[PDB]
């Protein structure tokens, strides 16, 4: 099964990736509602998920370049505000928001 | 308990920070079964969450709890050099006390 653990500090996506990879895990990517809720259970605040549309705008992929199927976007999202929001966070209500990859948030790592 | 190993080596202070970052602690085997599980996740010598820093030759976990199960390599713990207050699990599963300032892999433990 997948196990999810939340970080204590906030950091941008690249650091988030490095943290999870240090323990041979990856940034959490919910594949269904059950997993999305499991990630919610561990994230005490807005947290990064391992999904981006960095390759092609509005085409969301997990960190291994695999296009995602399940999505749980907050109403009005993804909106790619300003100079661009190509990373994704899980809001405190479980819904998703696209945000700048350079912004800092807690990170939830996934292991199995 | 879930056990995860780091890929890079680092001293105990940094090992503790890493496990603590994800709300876990440096792995402390409480029996032979956990010892084997940790050995298997670690691909090389790795730190355990046990030290005798507070009191020499009194080994306890990172929360002050004295350890009951031990699996010391023959001749250990020996506190050689200028002192060895940290502990590593060798590639054969036995333990060796080493300087806390030295760098090894780290196996983190989560509940
Ligand atoms: C940096 C950041 O979190 N910006 C968010 C944006 O992503 C979101 O789409 C918008 C509408 O809810 O609110 C904020 O502007
Ligand atoms: C720094 C280090 O790993 N020293 C070890 C010491 O801990 C161990 O007791 C001894 C056993 O032969 O070998 C080495 O000297
Ligand atoms: Ca985008
Ligand atoms: Ca947005
Ligand atoms: Ca000692
Ligand atoms: Ca020794
Ligand atoms: Cl020491």
Curated annotation (Swiss-Prot), chain A:
What does the function comment of this entry state? Answer: Calcium-dependent lectin involved in innate immune defense. Binds mannose, fucose and N-acetylglucosamine on different microorganisms and activates the lectin complement pathway. Binds to late apoptotic cells, as well as to apoptotic blebs and to necrotic cells, but not to early apoptotic cells, facilitating their uptake by macrophages.
What the entry says about domains is: The coiled-coil domain mediates trimerization.
Protein name in UniProt: Mannose-binding protein C
Cystine residue pairs: 20-109, 87-101
What GO terms fall under cellular component here? collagen trimer; extracellular space; multivesicular body; protein-containing complex; serine-type endopeptidase complex
GO MF annotations in UniProt:
calcium ion binding; calcium-dependent protein binding; D-mannose binding; galactose binding; identical protein binding; phosphatidylinositol-4-phosphate binding; protease binding; signaling receptor binding
Superkingdom to which the source organism belongs: Eukaryota
The UniProt record lists the C-type lectin domain at 1-110
């Amino acid at each position: 099964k997948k196990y999810f653990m939340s970080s204590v500090r906030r950091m941008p996506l690249n650091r988030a990736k490095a943290l999870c990879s240090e323990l041979q895990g990856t940034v959490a990517t919910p594949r269904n509602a059950e997993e999305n809720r499991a990630i919610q259970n561990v994230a005490k605040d807005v947290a990064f998920l391992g999904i981006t549309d960095q390759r092609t705008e509005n085409v969301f992929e997990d960190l291994t370049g695999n296009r995602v199927r399940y999505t749980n976007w907050n109403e009005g999202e993804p909106n790619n505000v300003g100079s661009g929001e190509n990373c994704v966070v899980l809001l405190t209500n479980g819904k998703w928001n696209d945000v700048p990859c350079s912004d800092s948030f807690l990170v939830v790592c996934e292991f199995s």
